[PDB]
Each structure stands twice: as structure tokens, then as C-alpha cells.
Amino acid sequence: IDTHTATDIYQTLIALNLDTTVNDCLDKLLNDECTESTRENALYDYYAL
Amino acid sequence: PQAHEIVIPSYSKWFNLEKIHSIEVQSLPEFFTNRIPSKTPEVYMRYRNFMVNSYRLNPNEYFSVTTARRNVSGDAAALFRLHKFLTKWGLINYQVDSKLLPKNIEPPLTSQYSTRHDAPRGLFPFESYKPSVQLPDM
Amino acid sequence: LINYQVDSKLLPKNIEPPLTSQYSTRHDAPRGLFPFESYKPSVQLPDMAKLKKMMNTSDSESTLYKYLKESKR
Amino acid sequence: VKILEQIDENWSKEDLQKLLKGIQEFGADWYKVAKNVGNKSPEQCILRFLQLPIEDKFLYSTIAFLVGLVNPKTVQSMTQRAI
Amino acid sequence: HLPFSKSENPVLSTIAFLVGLVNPKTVQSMTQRAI
């Protein structure tokens, strides 16, 4: 009996992994020791997200 | 220079002062069989843009075909045809009159956008129970 | 062969092509078919990450770990 | 993971760069953002912006082909879930 | 599931093979020509 359960966990997992990616790119661009060729990517990424 | 606010009956939003459209040819083909050399899509567009500019100048007050006839011509007949045509399509002489209203208000208003049942694209109003956390997530 | 040094002598219409426009043909369908209202401009936070974070005060994570290890016999 | 958005053609990198930069702190004023980019029609920006993937979230079924509705579950419907 | 990494929550159960066997036993083809 797997109708709502699987559905809702999929839905949640979407935004979960999303927010994880958000925090990831955020910290990456924040760590200025990373190149100002990787950063701009992450910046536009956070923009779009 | 621009000094007026020009509106058009939207359905006309296929016309472009720059180009031509299959609509008008099916309504005014006599410039497209390429039979009468003194007529051509080009002179057509010339007349067209000329007249629409004229109207858009002082659109508050009417504009006549006779006016253009005085101004420029290669024909009376076709001139009148296309003039009355554009008239029908309201591209010309559409804002000849003005009409106003106080517009009292009602429970629905353009600045009203709240949370409520939705016909649009997907949305999830119930997220997750406890045991959902029990997953080795990503 | 003639007139190669000039940029003038044009004809008037006392006009120029304008560019401003507006549109309104309201019956009910365009300008939107008038949907119900909605919301949600910005994304939000789950806050479950801490609830999901490995902590000896886990809601059930440590609890279910101990459950497995004390019930698998 | 590692979602790249430098993935478009016929618009330079900096095109969409300025695009998103504008829409970031400009709040969908399509006229502003069109001004705020290098000669693209406002509607063009709207369209392109509308076709911007988020290709890292949709995962490839019973739920994967149905939402806001589902087969009931007290009988052997999981046969569906193994489609 | 497999076509759905999102699976029903569980820690000790049996779901897929269960219905599998239900359908299997239902076949009654004691000489089922198959795999």
C-alpha cells in the first residue's frame, strides 16, 4: 500500500536535496579561497535557484 | 516625438507597422496577383503606414479617407477600400470618442491574490509525516 | 554618376513612425480567464535538517538505531 | 548535484548573466530587465527565462505519471508500482 | 521502488515478493511453461 507515502516522500525529497544544493553552492562561493571562476558560477546558481 | 496614449482592440494584435500578414491579403488581394504593375505590396505598405501614422497623430478626432485622397493617391477606389478596411479593423479612427466611468468596487479586485484552492499547476499542501525522516536521504 | 556628395532632399509627411501602443479587448477570457488567487513567490526552509541531523538527542534516529540493535536478536 | 546554467545557445553567457542579475534585484519588471540586457525583446527574455531547466530535481511510474490523484490501496495495486 | 527510488517506509517487512507470490500461486499452472 504505497500511494501517498511514496508520493509525499518524493515530493519532500525534491525540496530537501534542493536546499542541500543551495547551501552547498552558497558555502562554496562564500569560501573566497575558491577561484573567481568557480564562484561566479555558484553565484548565478543561487540566483536561479 | 510621442505625445499620446494609443490603444487598439487587442484581437488586432497581429498587425505590425513593419510587416504584412496573410490576413490583409486575403482581405485585399488586389495588390498581390502581381498583375497590375502600378500596384505592389510596397506602395500598399506605404499607404498603410502613412495613414496609420496620420490617425495616431491626433487620434482624439476623426480622420477621413477623403483626407488621404487629397494628400496622396494612386487611386480613389483602392484607397477607399483599404481605408474603410482598416476602419473596420479599428487600426484607424478607433479612439475618435472617449468614454469614462467612476467604477465602484466589488469583493474581487486586481490587487487580490491570496492562498486558496488552485486550478493551476501542481502544489502540495501536506508535506510529510514523522517516519518519512527515516530515509537515508541525499 | 551624379549626386554622390549629399545626404538631403527628401519628401515630407510631417510625421515619423511612432512606437507606443496599448491593448484592451475585454470580454472575459483575455486579461486572464480570472483564475482563483494564489501565492508562493519565494522558496522556504524545511528546518528538518537538524531534526534529521545525527545527534544523540535524535527524535528517533538514535532511537531507531538502538531499536534495531536491541531487537535484531 | 553541480547544477550548471551556462548551458544556453544564441544567447551569450553574459546575456543570461545580465538577465538573471536584473531579475534578481528587479522583481520581474520586464521593461527594466529588457533595458537591463543587451538588445533582446522583453518577451524574448520572458520566454528564454521560462525555458530554464532545473535539471537535477525531476526523477524518472505510478506516481511519476500521476499526481493529486492515485489508485486506492487496500488490494494488490502495487502491481502498478511495479509497472 | 525501482522505477521510483522513493519507496514505502519500512525497517523490517516484505512487500514486492509478497504480491509476486500471490500472483504466482494464483497461476495454478503446476506445469507453467516459462523461465
Please give the full DSSP string across D7-36, using - where no structure is assigned. --SSS-HHHHHHHHHHHHTTTT-HHHHHHT
CA–CA distances in Å: residue A32 to residues A24, A40, D24: 14, 11, 22
Which residues of chain B neighbour A11 with C-beta distances below 8 Å? 124, 127-128
* Phi and psi based region of residue D2 (left: phi greater than 0; alpha: psi -120 to 50; beta: remaining): left
Method: cryo-EM
Q: How far apart are CA B107 and CA B21, in angstroms?
A: 42
Is B134 within 8 Å of chain E by CB? yes
D4, three cell numbers:
550548471
Q: Which residue shows C-alpha cell 506445469?
A: E31
Q: Which residues of B99-134 are buried (b: 16+ CB within 10 A; e: fewer)?
A: eeeeeeeeeeeeeeeeeeeeeeeeeeeeebeeebbb
Sign of CA dihedral D70, D72, D73, D79: negative
d(CA B38, CA B16): 24
Q: What are phi and psi of C49, to 5 degrees?
A: -50, -50
Q: For residue E2, what is the nearest residue in chain D, using CA coordinates?
A: D82
Residue B16 bridge partners (DSSP):
B19
C-alpha cell at B106: 466589488
All residues of chain E having their beta carbon less than 8 Å from the beta carbon of residue B131 are 9
- Interchain contact, A18 vs D57, CB within 8 Å: yes
CB D69 within 8 A of CB E10: no
- Please give the radius of gyration of chain E, using alpha carbons only, rounded to the nearest integer: 14
DSSP string, E4-26: -S-----SS---HHHHHHHHHHH
Do E22 and D76 form a contact (C-beta atoms < 8 A)?
yes
Tell me how far apart the alpha carbons of residues B34 and B41 are, in angstroms, rounded to a whole number.
9
Find the distance separating the first CA and the last CA of chain A, reported in whole Å. 34
User: Are the beta carbons of E11 and B134 closer than 8 angstroms?
Assistant: yes
Confirm or reject contact between A9 and chain E (CB < 8 A).
yes
Do the beta carbons of residue B56 and residue B6 sit within 8 Å? yes
Q: Could you tell me the CA-to-CA distances from D32 to B82, B129, C41, D18, D24 in Å, in that order?
A: 38, 44, 19, 12, 12
Q: How many Å lie between the alpha carbon of C65 and the closest alpha carbon of chain A? A: 21
Tell me if chain E has a CB within 8 Å of the CB of A3: no
Distance in Å, alpha carbon of B113 to nearest chain C alpha carbon: 4
Class of residue D62 by CB neighbours under 10 A (exposed 0-12, middle 13-18, buried 19+) = buried
Cβ of B133 within 8 Å of Cβ of C13? The answer is no
Task: Pick the residue of C43, C50, C52, C53 with the most A CBs within 10 A to test the interface with A by mutation.
Answer: C43
| Ramachandran angles phi, psi of C22, nearest 5° | -145, 165
Q: Does the distance separating the beta carbons of A7 and E9 come in below 8 Å?
A: no
In 3D space, the residue among B138, D25, C40, D59 whose CA is nearest the CA of residue A24 turns out to be B138
Q: Are C46 and A49 a contacting pair at CB < 8 A? A: no
List residues of C whose CB lies inside 8 A of any B CB. Answer: 13, 15-25, 30, 34-40, 48, 51-52, 59-61, 64
Residue B134 has which C-alpha cell? 527515516
Which position has the grid cell 515619423?
C16
Burial class of residue A4 in the structure, from the number of CB atoms within 10 Å of its CB (0-12 exposed, 13-18 middle, 19+ buried): middle
SS3 B7: strand
Interface test with C, best of A8, A14, A19 (most C CBs within 10 A): A19
Question: Resolution of the experimental model in angstroms, please?
Answer: 9.0
Buried residues in B39-68 as b, exposed as e (16+ CB within 10 A): beeeebeebbebbbbbbbbebeeebebeeb
Residues 6+ apart with CB under 8 A from E29: none
Is A7 within 8 Å of chain E by CB? yes
Q: What letter represents residue B101's amino acid? A: L
**Residue B19 pairs with which residues in a beta bridge?**
B16
> In the beta sheet, which residues pair with residue B7?
C22
- Give me the residue from A5, A7, A13 closest to E9, CB to CB: A5
User: CA–CA separation, E1 vs B95, rounded Å?
Assistant: 64
C-alpha cell at D60: 524518472
* H or E element at residue A24: helix A4-30
Helical residues (DSSP H) of B58-109, grouped into ranges:
65-71, 77-88
If we measure between CA atoms, which residue out of B13, B9, B5 comes closest to residue B88? B9
With beta carbons less than 8 A apart as the criterion, state whether D45 and D19 touch. yes
Q: What is the three-state SS of chain C?
A: CCCCCCCCCCCCCCCCCCCCCEECCCCCCCCCCCCCCCCCCCCCCCCHHHHHCCCCCCCCHHHHHHHHHHHCC
Q: Give the H/E segment covering residue D43.
A: helix D42-50
d(CA B121, CA B117): 11
Which 3 state secondary structure label does DSSP give B8? strand
Helix runs in chain B, H state only? 22-27, 41-57, 65-71, 77-88
Nearest residue in E to B135, CA atom = E9
What is the H or E stretch that residue D44 is in?
A: helix D42-50
Length of chain C: 73
Nearest one of D79, D6, D16, D11 to D49, comparing CA atoms: D16
Q: Do the Cβ atoms of A4 and D66 come closer than 8 Å?
A: no
A15 touches chain C (CB under 8 A): yes
> What does the block give as the cell for B49?
503606414
Place of cell 519628401: C11
